[PDB]
């Protein structure tokens, strides 16, 4: 209804997940993931929300999302030294960061062992470091 | 055994508490001399990387730290560094502190002082479109 699609593309990501519940060492594969970013109105509050959703054909159980409002975003900005405001955030990553990964920015997705959660991480490599920009914890939709 | 790898005056942002009683910070752009060298530890014979900063504004502004391979491993771990101890200084010097040719954004240096000026954090940044892009920080101690 109020939902507005800002971004809907297939990107190459590295997918990591522990070998098992007891073995936290990751196995890692390059994989294609569909990322959708939209804005919507919270039904109870009327406030603006940013929704992130990932899926991939490889695994029907692979359905994750998170919704950020202004306050959730402030926490994110604080934790990652983000320099843009809530309203600018999606526009800048879409226009300056994500377009590069569509089927140098890198995307990592890290799964829970039980696949209840995944961390959606964006990177911009430096000559001496990984250059992690932020990570958002997404939860299983299913 | 000391070998100079880098000896240059750079523009930094200097942050420090208002006073010993006022923890809130004030910020100024300032010129700082940064020296990076390699040397042999006298007792162990191992290679050491020495960072030294100074500035003419304040004679008591004299800070250094020496990193050996082990100290570096801790740094690389804390900051997701992707190069080894031997490459570290060469890459920073050649790719982060270097002057680009006039024909991911420019590097920025932050120096954060202790209120008592016993320690300062030497921080290197490479700005992104949405974030500060802190690369690493090294705690230097008063000389």
Author numbering:
A (entry chain A): 2 to 104, 130 to 168
B (entry chain B): 3 to 105, 128 to 167
How do the authors describe this structure?
Here, we demonstrate that the centriolar protein SAS-6 forms rod-shaped homodimers that interact through their N-terminal domains to form oligomers. Proteins of the SAS-6 family comprise an N-terminal domain with the evolutionarily conserved PISA motif, followed by a segment with a predicted coiled coil and a less-conserved C-terminal region predicted to be disordered. Furthermore and in conclusion, because these residues are well conserved among SAS-6 orthologs, we propose that the self-assembly of SAS-6 homodimers into a 9-fold symmetric ring structure is a fundamental property at the root of the universal 9-fold symmetry of centrioles.
Next, we determined the structure of the N-terminal globular domain of C. elegans SAS-6 (ceN) by X-ray crystallography. We obtained crystals of a ceN variant and solved its structure to 2.1 Å resolution. The asymmetric unit of the crystal contained a dimer of ceN monomers with local 2-fold symmetry (ceN-dimer). The fold of ceN is reminiscent of that of the XRCC4 family of DNA repair proteins (Junop et al., 2000). We noted that a striking interaction interface in the ceN-dimer was mediated by I154 at the tip of the β6-β7 loop of one monomer, which was inserted deeply into a hydrophobic cavity of the second monomer. Both I154 and the residues shaping the hydrophobic cavity are well conserved among SAS-6 orthologs, suggesting functional relevance. Isothermal titration calorimetry (ITC) experiments yielded a Kd for the N-N interaction of ∼110 ± 30 μM, two orders of magnitude higher than that of the ceCC coiled coil. To address whether I154 mediates ceN-dimer formation, we substituted this residue for the charged residue glutamate (ceN[I154E]). Although the conformation of the domain was not altered by this mutation, AUC experiments revealed that this change abrogated dimer formation. Interestingly, inspection of the ceN-dimer structure suggested that the β6-β7 loop encompassing I154 might promote an interaction between SAS-6 homodimers, as this residue is located diametrically across the ceN domain's C terminus, which proceeds into the coiled coil.
